[PDB]
Amino acid sequence: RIERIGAHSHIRGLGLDDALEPRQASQGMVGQLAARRAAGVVLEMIREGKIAGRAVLIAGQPGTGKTAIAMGMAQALGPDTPFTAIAGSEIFSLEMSKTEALTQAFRRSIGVRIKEETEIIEGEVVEIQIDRPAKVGKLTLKTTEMETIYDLGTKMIESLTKDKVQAGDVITIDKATGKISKLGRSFTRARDYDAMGSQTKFVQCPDGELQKRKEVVHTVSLHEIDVINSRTQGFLALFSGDTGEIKSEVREQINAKVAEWREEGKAEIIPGVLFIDEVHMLDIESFSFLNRALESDMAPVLIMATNRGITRIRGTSYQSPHGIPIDLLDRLLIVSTTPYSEKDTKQILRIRCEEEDVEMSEDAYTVLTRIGLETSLRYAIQLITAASLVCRKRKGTEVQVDDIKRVYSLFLDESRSTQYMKEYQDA
Amino acid sequence: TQRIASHSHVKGLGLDESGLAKQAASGLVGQENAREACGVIVELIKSKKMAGRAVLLAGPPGTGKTALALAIAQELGSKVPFCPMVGSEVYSTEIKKTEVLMENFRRAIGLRIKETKEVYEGEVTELTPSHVIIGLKTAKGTKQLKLDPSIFESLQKERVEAGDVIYIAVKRQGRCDTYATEFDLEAEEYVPLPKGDVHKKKEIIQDVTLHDLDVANARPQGGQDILSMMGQLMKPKKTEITDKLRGEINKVVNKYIDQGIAELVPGVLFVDEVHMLDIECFTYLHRALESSIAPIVIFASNRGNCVIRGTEDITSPHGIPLDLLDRVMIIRTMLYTPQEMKQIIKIRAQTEGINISEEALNHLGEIGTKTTLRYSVQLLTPANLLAKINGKDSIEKEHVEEISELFYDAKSSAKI
Amino acid sequence: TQRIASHSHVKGLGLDESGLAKQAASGLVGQENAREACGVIVELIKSKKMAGRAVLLAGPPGTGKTALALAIAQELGSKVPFCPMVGSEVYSTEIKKTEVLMENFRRAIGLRIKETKEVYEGEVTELTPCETENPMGGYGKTISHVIIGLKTAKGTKQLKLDPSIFESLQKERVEAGDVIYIEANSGAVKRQGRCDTYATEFDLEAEEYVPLPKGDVHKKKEIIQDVTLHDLDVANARPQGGQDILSMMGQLMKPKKTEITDKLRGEINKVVNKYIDQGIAELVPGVLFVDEVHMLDIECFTYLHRALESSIAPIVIFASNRGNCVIRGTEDITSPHGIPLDLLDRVMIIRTMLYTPQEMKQIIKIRAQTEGINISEEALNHLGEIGTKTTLRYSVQLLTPANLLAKINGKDSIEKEHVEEISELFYDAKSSAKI
Amino acid sequence: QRIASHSHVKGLGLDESGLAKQAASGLVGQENAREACGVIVELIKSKKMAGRAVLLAGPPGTGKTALALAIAQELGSKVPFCPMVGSEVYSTEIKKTEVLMENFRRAIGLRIKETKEVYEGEVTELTPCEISHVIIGLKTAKGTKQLKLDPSIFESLQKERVEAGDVIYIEANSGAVKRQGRCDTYATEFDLEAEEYVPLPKGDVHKKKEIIQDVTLHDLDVANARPQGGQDILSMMGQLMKPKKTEITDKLRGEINKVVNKYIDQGIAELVPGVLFVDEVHMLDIECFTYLHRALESSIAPIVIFASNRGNCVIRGTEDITSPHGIPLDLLDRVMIIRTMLYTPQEMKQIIKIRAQTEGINISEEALNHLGEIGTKTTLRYSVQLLTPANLLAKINGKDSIEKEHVEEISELFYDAKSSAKILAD
Amino acid sequence: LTLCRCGESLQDVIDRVAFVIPPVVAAPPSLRVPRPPPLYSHRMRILRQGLREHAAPYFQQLRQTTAPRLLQFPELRLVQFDSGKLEALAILLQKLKSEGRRVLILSQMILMLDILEMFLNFHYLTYVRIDENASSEQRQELMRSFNRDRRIFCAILSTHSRTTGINLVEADTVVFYDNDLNPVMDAKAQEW
Ligand SMILES: Nc1ncnc2c1ncn2[C@@H]1O[C@H](COP(=O)(O)OP(=O)(O)O)[C@@H](O)[C@H]1O
Ligand SMILES: Nc1ncnc2c1ncn2[C@@H]1O[C@H](COP(=O)(O)OP(=O)(O)O)[C@@H](O)[C@H]1O
Ligand SMILES: Nc1ncnc2c1ncn2[C@@H]1O[C@H](COP(=O)(O)OP(=O)(O)O)[C@@H](O)[C@H]1O
Ligand SMILES: Nc1ncnc2c1ncn2[C@@H]1O[C@H](COP(=O)(O)OP(=O)(O)O)[C@@H](O)[C@H]1O
């Protein structure tokens, strides 16, 4: 519950209507109807997943809400669909090539819902009488509507001895493997032992004696390749990034078995999204790889964001729009974000204030909207926070003009920093 | 259903009996000379006589060189391996670059080997022990096998009532014998008694590539000696040596071949984005193509006359040096006309599952010939979604117009 | 050993109750607006309401940016963690730059985890009161309870524990006369060792005899452990327990610091939230002071202005000393403070003016005081004058050598002659430029 | 013998008075550089100085490497001589500075004087008594006795699969090994056991001899850079990086130096400083020259001979700084520079004749003149290279010696750098 | 602490690792072995000493040795999914067991009997198979074991034997999995 509000916490989805009509202000967003409708339609395409290898480029001036609309789409997509957010400079690893990192990122945003039929027996253990030789045992499971006694085997008795199960424990035994899983207790333990005090759990299902076809959908991403590349996979799946596995017999074989599962009804493919923020940091080799990697059937939807116009492509000398080669730039379609006006700026500032739980006068809102239209929006939020803190220190109830104007001089913007920078501190 | 891809519409070259390139067939359209050259190339591949040859599918962007190579692969068939590669793939941080290209050349080649495996299955009746005289029982009969100690099982593998299946080089405890009536609740699950004979030999025609054997003999993981387990305990790697690469492997493969044990299956290696490879890659490819054991390689370049990477001083056509560019045949693909653009747009819409009206198709073809064909191809799906939202089953001109208004092409974005 | 560091006089921002700035601000002098901004941002930190916020301590060299940084750090107190980092440390040959930055961000975040355990200890006097066989079945011999006579230094208290634990008692060598470590819920017995009262001087053995427990038998030990999120990341990264990890050759290379985002985020964050909302731990976000931020590559800034966008990112205090300079890793891309113009928009710039000659004199005097050497009025005036001429940091470095020269010359206080001689024996770079 | 490029150089060619003869010991001319070489070789033989540097500077093909090999030969195999190349410093698993320090350490050698004795004995007489005391029998071709050993030797022996009738070597201080069979294993007619047998050893049952093993400090460092084996720490598999990344100097090299000094004071060890010949010095980076001009100043640095072929050029790693000999002025100073002069046509012909005599090729008078002319035309190395195929063709054509026709034909067949560049303009 | 190692909500890590293991090594051979016709005693002794030293720490056991996978057997689910008849049979048997009625499964092919055996094992339904291989007395013994034994749920018959030995019925529920439409077979089959 203790998680602080970040720069994109004010947004909590992409405000859209039944007909995908964008709204002025909803779900923490304001203005920018065109790019928001583009986000809505690409999100509909993602949730459809019928087509693979689609790319979208979010372009615009800084502070136009590129990362904002990206996080909004991520939120609107909701759980059950992977959304791999990554920065352009994260692919540069000292233990795995750029192409390998891109393959990892692509396969990481693809999920397979594996269906598994289970048969679990549950109930209340009324009698767990076990005859230890130092071989024979019987279990008396009880439910709210029926009871049954089961003769326990040697291995089952040993498993029960492993996980201590006293009378009155709510357990869920899997008839397939016999794994002992304790859920709780139905009553106290004799009220006499001067220890082991806990709370009592609710009774089990009436038909819990034998659940026939308990369906559990195990969801896992296509990053499962780490499970095969090495005999010990947890080390690679948890921390180790040195996963330069062999592409042959791993990628192709896993894809083939995933197709077999999809055809045989075991699992279903759920393509996610790969959001590369500041994609301009990718080397030209990474762009050349994305050009081809984006053509596979397992290719997720590649959302990218650029904050530049004509700029040199990293790893070469010639320039291209958005710092992306002409090929990949032409392949994808671009979503331009128009700057926000004064009203939109004021509304965004008000939404941020509401998020931060801070209140300020109308004149404060006006002067702060002015300052934000002049300097920037993020700087306006910084001033919101600073003025709220100055007001709290001042013992006031709401932020007045005298606090925003004070924190404006206390904290400087880059435009004024460079102005006072004429002291030639260093070069 | 299977999700659509970028090149899932191409099914093959679609040539006539004499190789005549039809206007449109097998998903492809246009590029008659290119598709005829590709027919000749697949004939070469099927010949399985020449080795080390290569071809360059150099052409302007959007001509379909990649889709063309994928159609070539489809036409060739799944038997002959077709290894796709990106120029950036060679750049690795654990294996040498030229060695990456070498292992790619190797994996590109296929090998179909035949082997007879003796399998021992049945419920274990006796497990008395170095050599272990195990007893397997099946519906046919019982046999006391004089198995070797190397197969002695470490895990539970109960002495009795355990169903085991062994083959000569690991054992698999299938499941517990069908004693479900002995106990009412037991952790172990049961399977029926195997009906097949204990000792059975089955011939499996397995298809593998030469690089599989290469990397396997490089760092084997079989055997039972402790030194082996300690060696393969952690950090697998690459960079097989040339002496083991050639020599022993080629000799054993030729042995299997001339003895009827295996059958060589030459494949293809599609090195895409060759225009951005370093000069070292080209210098190694020089000798690679000049080898009696190198497979066919299909290159797909997109750049024109540009500076070769790794030198940043000298320029050459197609970003490939002249000495190499001459070693590979050139396939010149031309740009599609607005008519061909509209035709391929309609083909993709049919494959992609989208219904488009005549006016909508015309507007899409116009937007394509104006900005880019692939741009309209990308706009196809958004228009279908807009139609669905608006309740229209088929796309109309207004839908594609609104889509284009929402999404700006690369050219328009650059104009801004 | 006091081991006076370069600048240890700073003890805090020294702001008045009203939040304004004063001269004697707990060691640090001058820099009114800068110290007020430091107070505002430290109040922000204490609020623990905002995350991913960065501040830039831009200012010419010698303005004491690191000084005020350590001041605000001390003001925060040892309670919240403070991870100092320099731009050069990001360049690692084994782990990528962005992952080092993320590890530093994690270190900057603290987490106090409490743990209360009810345990019983004392000299055991085992005895099983015979009880009639299970009344539900037939007859025979059973045990319904097992009484353990735990004897502690304060007294004795018999515990009628559950009989099922008898297996644990027999498992370990729990004989009458030894100290056992009982657990309330688990019940597992862990023998500490025999009582020292029986440790005869003639018995040769160690680690087997332990003193009697002091206090009541029932002890509710409350312990708190403060570990940063990076500590938990590292702990959950590497394995432990068998699995042939004892190998030397193929395992001694412990520097596998490479980390993935799935483990870093996700499960760890969820378990932290579970411990927080359940009452087992309390999150404590700290601060990440990054001096020489201009030394980072553009591949580092492009990841910084994305990590700062996360809700979990802590407060970062950048301190750039250079001016308009080309960004590292870029082709003649000049930007203010050597930082891309895109990141400067996300940081609050706290400008620091140059110290007034009077402030120079105050700094020299307080540094001399901290060093513990008396300086005459004339010597202090000469030190202030030379600190006005050249860089101020040169004067403070002339105190200890001048002090030693004075002590060796037979005098206690630093006379003007001593500083005059040291200025000719040692000089600054501005004068050394005369090649 | 597989005559090499510097085989005829079997010495430096200095007389008793120290002057360099006009032509002797395989060398011809170059009296000044030969005198400098004969002075620095005496400097090295003095064994008193440390870290002194030398630079054999001069145009290409002047014999600087020949002079280095002559110095090495004159010094003799009793002192270490490490032939080193600049490109070798660019290691992938060890830093350049560390490779340079390892070469410096290799350039220092010490002789270990030790008198070891053995206690070979018969296993058939194995009769322990008490595990606390054991006795072994001795039966050689010259005598028979018995010995008494500490039970530790009996443990180390039974560790090996000893059998009756085997020859076992027992050292007086530590160690033991088995030799199977003493003319009794093949007698019983039992088949082989994957090992070869050996008859009983001759000589006395107890032997003693003086031992002198030439070991260098780098060997000690490498041996101390590992756990030495023994217990579970003995784990060793393929790919083991025996040349580990680096080894600290204060706590590892310092201890080696201390123990060496101790054993020298005790008279057990004798130090013999060697020479470090670093060829193609211009290939080293500036960050290597800066550490080299400082490491050779230590009290333990040996004599280092340098050789810079190319003249003034840009220093490696700088791209802007240019210094003579491709070496910075910092390292250039403090290094005695020995200038090598070019050879005269008569000296070239004499060197060609010496090469022909050494390699076994026989050349005629006119043939020698033509070969010397072809050499002075472009370079002596071209004539040295053409000398062999000339005699090869002569043998093919049935001629024992080389004539004008054969030399002219082989010169027209192949081409030199000058000739190649002349025709390369096409 | 405990982690999920994946995106699933909650599940045993062992189950996670056991579910997804598609690939097996393509062609793993044994290790290379130098073959010098003479083997010097020194190297062989050193190698034997090393093997003995490595075998001494056996207390670890390498946790099953983590041996590679080389078989990749087919999933048991495919037995049912491969045929809708078996899915309908699963539904019917689940219904009948929820009702408590035994089942008498009738099939014609012995291979189909093995298929039904694997299917019931997938459903954990205890069964007793009576086929032609078992002699008349063995068939009667199997029928007697099925009768009066409420722990046995299903009974599988071949429908091609005489079956004149069966005497008593338990739950009066029969399932004709296969239909033969043969002249004499079906007649006497349905009759008995
Ligand atoms: N539509 C919007 N609604 C609310 N805040 C916005 C919006 N657009 C931009 N911002 C704010 O501007 C700052 C930077 O803009 P951002 O959302 O990152 O877009 P961009 O990626 O173009 O900078 C952020 O702090 C963000 O909160
Ligand atoms: N001959 C063709 N027939 C049908 N469609 C084509 C043809 N050539 C190209 N395409 C289409 O053009 C799109 C891009 O072609 P592509 O293979 O990427 O060209 P390139 O290889 O030059 O990048 C593909 O999605 C495919 O639909
Ligand atoms: N206001 C001040 N009062 C006392 N000492 C100061 C003050 N400002 C700077 N100093 C001194 O300056 C020295 C270093 O300052 P520092 O924080 O490193 O600035 P910069 O990093 O810009 O050089 C410290 O040793 C400290 O003693
Ligand atoms: N003084 C000499 N007398 C005889 N032969 C010489 C003499 N100097 C050089 N040579 C020969 O000339 C060749 C030059 O080789 P080298 O010493 O490598 O030249 P550089 O001076 O470039 O090192 C050597 O092979 C050597 O045999």
Curated annotation (Swiss-Prot), chain A:
SMART domains per UniProt: AAA
UniProt cross-references to Pfam families, sorted A to Z: TIP49 (PF06068), TIP49_C (PF17856)
Domain of life according to the entry: Eukaryota
GO biological process: box C/D snoRNP assembly; cellular response to estradiol stimulus; cellular response to UV; chromatin remodeling; DNA recombination; DNA repair; establishment of protein localization to chromatin; negative regulation of canonical Wnt signaling pathway
Record field: catalytic activity: ATP + H2O = ADP + phosphate + H(+)
Keywords: Acetylation, Activator, ATP-binding, Chromatin regulator, Cytoplasm, DNA damage, DNA recombination, DNA repair, Growth regulation, Helicase, Hydrolase, Isopeptide bond, Membrane, Nucleotide-binding, Nucleus, Phosphoprotein, Transcription, Transcription regulation, Ubl conjugation
EC number: 3.6.4.12
Tissue: Ubiquitously expressed. Highly expressed in testis and thymus.
GO MF annotation, one: identical protein binding
Residues modified to Phosphoserine: S415
Effect of K66M: No effect on interaction with NOPCHAP1
Outcome of swapping E278Q: Reduces ATPase activity. Decreases interaction with NOPCHAP1. No effect on formation of RUVBL1-RUVBL2 heteromeric complex
One cellular-component annotation, GO: membrane
Lyase found in the keyword field: no
Signal peptide interval: none
Record cross-link Glycyl lysine isopeptide (Lys-Gly) (interchain with G-Cter in SUMO2), residues: K422
Cellular localisation: Nucleus matrix; Nucleus, Nucleoplasm; Cytoplasm; Membrane
Domain commentary: The C-terminal domain is required for association with ATF2.
Protein family according to the UniProt entry: Belongs to the RuvB family.
Protein name (Swiss-Prot/TrEMBL): RuvB-like 2
Originating species: Homo sapiens (Human)
Gene designation per UniProt: RUVBL2
Curated annotation (Swiss-Prot), chain B:
The keyword Transcription regulation is annotated on this UniProt entry: yes
Keywords carried by this UniProt record: Acetylation, Activator, ATP-binding, Cell cycle, Cell division, Chromatin regulator, Cytoplasm, Cytoskeleton, DNA damage, DNA recombination, DNA repair, Growth regulation, Helicase, Hydrolase, Isopeptide bond, Membrane, Mitosis, Nucleotide-binding, Nucleus, Transcription, Transcription regulation, Ubl conjugation
InterPro entries linked: AAA+_ATPase, P-loop_NTPase, RuvB-like, RuvB-like_C, RuvBL1/2_DNA/RNA_bd_dom, TIP49_P-loop
TM regions (residue ranges): none
Annotated GO MF terms: ADP binding; ATP binding; ATP hydrolysis activity; ATPase binding; cadherin binding; DNA helicase activity; TBP-class protein binding; TFIID-class transcription factor complex binding
Enzyme class, UniProt record, top EC level: hydrolase
Localisation per UniProt entry: Nucleus matrix; Nucleus, Nucleoplasm; Cytoplasm; Membrane
Keyword DNA repair: yes
Record SUPFAM superfamilies: P-loop containing nucleoside triphosphate hydrolases
Cross-link for Glycyl lysine isopeptide (Lys-Gly) (interchain with G-Cter in SUMO1), residue positions: K195
EC number: 3.6.4.12
Domain of life: Eukaryota
Miscellaneous comment in the UniProt entry for this protein: High level of autoantibodies against RUVBL1 are detected in sera of patients with autoimmune diseases such as polymyositis/dermatomyosistis and autoimmune hepatitis.
Domain commentary: Binding to MYC is dependent on a Myc domain essential for oncogenic activity.
Name of the protein in its database record: RuvB-like 1
Swiss-Prot record, chain C:
UniProt-recorded Gene Ontology molecular function terms: ADP binding; ATP binding; ATP hydrolysis activity; ATPase binding; cadherin binding; DNA helicase activity; TBP-class protein binding; TFIID-class transcription factor complex binding
Function text: Possesses single-stranded DNA-stimulated ATPase and ATP-dependent DNA helicase (3' to 5') activity; hexamerization is thought to be critical for ATP hydrolysis and adjacent subunits in the ring-like structure contribute to the ATPase activity. Component of the NuA4 histone acetyltransferase complex which is involved in transcriptional activation of select genes principally by acetylation of nucleosomal histones H4 and H2A. This modification may both alter nucleosome-DNA interactions and promote interaction of the modified histones with other proteins which positively regulate transcription.
Location, primary (coarse class): nucleus
Further facts: High level of autoantibodies against RUVBL1 are detected in sera of patients with autoimmune diseases such as polymyositis/dermatomyosistis and autoimmune hepatitis.
Any one cellular-component term (Gene Ontology): extracellular exosome
Reaction equation(s) it catalyzes: ATP + H2O = ADP + phosphate + H(+)
SUPFAM superfamilies, per the entry: P-loop containing nucleoside triphosphate hydrolases
One Pfam match: TIP49_C
Glycyl lysine isopeptide (Lys-Gly) (interchain with G-Cter in SUMO1) cross-link, renumbered residues: K214
Family recorded in the similarity comment: Belongs to the RuvB family.
Enzyme class of the recorded protein, top EC level: hydrolase
Protein's UniProt keywords contain Cell division: yes
Comment text on domains: Binding to MYC is dependent on a Myc domain essential for oncogenic activity.
Binding-site residues for ATP, renumbered to this chain: G59, P60, P61, G62, T63, G64, K65, T66
Designated gene of the protein: RUVBL1
Protein name: RuvB-like 1
Swiss-Prot record, chain E:
Tissue: Ubiquitously expressed.
Intracellular or extracellular location(s): Nucleus
Residue ranges annotated for the Helicase C-terminal domain, each copy included: 85-192
Biological function: Component of the NuA4 histone acetyltransferase complex which is involved in transcriptional activation of select genes principally by acetylation of nucleosomal histones H4 and H2A. This modification may both alter nucleosome - DNA interactions and promote interaction of the modified histones with other proteins which positively regulate transcription. May be required for transcriptional activation of E2F1 and MYC target genes during cellular proliferation.
UniProt family annotation: Belongs to the SNF2/RAD54 helicase family. SWR1 subfamily.
Subunit structure: Component of the NuA4 histone acetyltransferase complex which contains the catalytic subunit KAT5/TIP60 and the subunits EP400, TRRAP/PAF400, BRD8/SMAP, EPC1, DMAP1/DNMAP1, RUVBL1/TIP49, RUVBL2, ING3, actin, ACTL6A/BAF53A, MORF4L1/MRG15, MORF4L2/MRGX, MRGBP, YEATS4/GAS41, VPS72/YL1 and MEAF6. May also participate in the formation of NuA4 related complexes which lack the KAT5/TIP60 catalytic subunit, but which include the SWI/SNF related protein SRCAP. The NuA4 complex interacts with MYC and the adenovirus E1A protein. EP400 interacts with TRRAP, RUVBL1 and RUVBL2.
The name this protein goes by in its record: E1A-binding protein p400
Higher taxonomy: Eukaryota, Metazoa, Chordata, Craniata, Vertebrata
Portion held of the full protein: 1815 to 2006 of 3159
